[PDB]
Structure formats: structure tokens, C-alpha cells
Amino acid sequence: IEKQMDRVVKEMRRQLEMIDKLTTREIEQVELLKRIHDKLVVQS
């Protein structure tokens, strides 16, 4: 019972880290896209 809980808890913590890394990387990609967008807005 304790061993099952630690397996589930360890799996959740791994998914929280992967979710954190994917959201961080997508936010940076969005920021980059917005900079390109703003360069296009002015230059057009």
C-alpha cells in the first residue's frame, strides 16, 4: 500500500516536471513569435 503510493507519487512528480518544462519552452516560443509579429507590424 505504501509501496503503491510511492510509485503513484513518483509518477505524478515526473509528469509535473515534464509539464513545467513543456509550458516554459512553449511560453518562450510564443514570446519569440510575438517579437517577429511586432517587427512585421511596424515594417508593413
Annotated binding site for Ca(2+): 26, 29
Hey, CA dihedral for 35, 36, 41, 44, is it positive or negative? positive
Smallest distance from its own copies to CB 7, Å = 10
Which residue of this chain has its Cβ atom nearest to Ni ion in the complex?
20
Q: What is the dihedral of CA 8, 11, 13, 17, to 10 degrees?
A: -160
Q: How many residues form the binding site for Ni ion (CB under 5 A)? A: 2
Element (H, E) at 5: helix 2-43
Range 2-41, binding its own copies (CB under 8 A): 2, 4-5, 8-9, 11-13, 15-16, 18-27, 29-34, 36-41
